[PDB]
Design a protein around this ligand. Structure first.
Ligand SMILES: [Ca+2]
Ligand SMILES: [Ca+2]
Ligand SMILES: [Ca+2]
Ligand SMILES: [Ca+2]
Ligand SMILES: [Ca+2]
Ligand SMILES: [Ca+2]
Lengths: 122, 122
């Protein structure tokens, strides 16, 4: 028959590699493309890869996640540790939250960061 | 017998009013004091008046509450409304919390105050 890969333009879309066969031809697609002639832009978001209510962006051969505040990582799977810098004063114990932290103050101390000393008042 | 209220100093403590009786005397105490001669400073914190883990200060004829952050009022009974100033952008719905608020953003918006527009990206 014909070599469809040697007539002129590439019959394979999205820069796929044209491979001649007897009676037809086949396309070797680039990452992110599918179909007999690489016509389809694969939806990389179709398997729901973005966690914790993240927004999935369907791109060429990849997805990108837009994380909700307090989350990070490729799949937004990481709850950022806000306690990392040890923010609680006066031996307060730090509790990690979503884009926030909580201090558990010892008796006689109050405030978000356990700043307020109350021992002198009592 | 004797007028104990006319000998000299006041037999009633903490500026209580001395009232003579036949065979004794009695004391008419000022607010915050008790006992036959007003000797006792009443503990106004004894009935646990301070709410939401507030610190109770036992004072003369009164208590004062030291509120935990996010609480106010005489008994620290009032959870301050942080949503009062309507902080959420783009028709976000405000949820009141403890010394904090939460914005429930409509689709296409993110961030603590719903600042981030994501509609143009998709
Ligand atoms: Ca052929
Ligand atoms: Ca894609
Ligand atoms: Ca966190
Ligand atoms: Ca008498
Ligand atoms: Ca008292
Ligand atoms: Ca509140």
């Amino acid at each position: 028959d014909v070599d469809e890969c040697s007539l002129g333009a590439n019959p394979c879309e999205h820069a796929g590699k044209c491979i001649n066969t007897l009676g037809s031809f086949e396309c070797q697609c680039l990452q992110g493309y599918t179909g007999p002639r690489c016509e389809i832009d694969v939806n990389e978001c179709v398997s729901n890869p973005c966690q914790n209510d993240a927004v999935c962006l369907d791109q060429i051969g990849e997805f990108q996640c837009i994380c909700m505040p307090g989350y990070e990582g490729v799949h937004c799977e990481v709850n950022t540790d806000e306690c990392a810098s040890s923010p609680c004063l006066h031996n307060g114990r730090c509790l990690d939250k979503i884009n926030e932290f909580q201090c558990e103050c010892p008796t006689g101390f109050t405030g978000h960061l356990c700043q307020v000393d109350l021992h002198h008042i009592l």
